[PDB]
Structure formats: structure tokens, C-alpha cells
């Protein structure tokens, strides 16, 4: 459709993490490390995100546990994601 698809995903973190990898997309003209959006590059077989089944490669992780992942460094985003624990709440874009 012509409109963005944004949806919530809640899942339980696994012992080996969320089970996905992230990349940034988009920068400012200053060329510093801030990324405009954060996107899923890979999903780990048998990991929490794979088992849940909803999140896909090239989905955007817009927000996690109330923390925006818009206009943030890749390191910041990954750190937020790594600090999740137990139930994790996402806003996902497609």
C-alpha cells in the first residue's frame, strides 16, 4: 500500500540475545556517526526473533522499550538493544 506499515512486536529475549543484526541507513551532510534509521540486516536461525517469526530482514526497528532508534548512532542503537532483558517491546516498520 502507499502508507507505511508500522506494527508492535513483543517477544522474550533469548540467552544468546535478541538474535538479529542491525545496520544504519541515512546520514546528515556533516557525515558524523548519527544514522537516520536502524534496520535489520540478518536474523539468527533459532534465535528469539526467528522463533517469533514476525520481524524480517530490511524491517526498520523504530523504537525499543520506549527508546527511539531514529537519529542515533549504530553503537547507541546496538547498546540499547543489548541492554534489553526479559520481555522486549518494539515498534517495527515495513
Amino acid at each position: 500500500g502507499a502508507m507505511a506499515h508500522v506494527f508492535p512486536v513483543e517477544l522474550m529475549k533469548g540467552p544468546e540475545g535478541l538474535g538479529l543484526s542491525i545496520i544504519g541507513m541515512g546520514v546528515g551532510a556533516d557525515a558524523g556517526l548519527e544514522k537516520l534509521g536502524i534496520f535489520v540486516k540478518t536474523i539468527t536461525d533459532n534465535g528469539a526473533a526467528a522463533r517469533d517469526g514476525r520481524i524480517q530482514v530490511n524491517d526498520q526497528i523504530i523504537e525499543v522499550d520506549g527508546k527511539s532508534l531514529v537519529g542515533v548512532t549504530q553503537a547507541y542503537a546496538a547498546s540499547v538493544l543489548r541492554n534489553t532483558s526479559g520481555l522486549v517491546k518494539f515498534q517495527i516498520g515495513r
Partner: peptide
């Protein structure tokens, strides 16, 4: 360049 940056695992 951004195009060769490594993905971060979480």
C-alpha cells in the same frame, strides 16, 4: 563509506 560498515549483532 556507509556501504561497507559491519552489522552489529544483538
Amino acid at each position: 563509506d556507509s556501504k561497507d560498515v559491519k552489522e552489529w549483532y544483538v
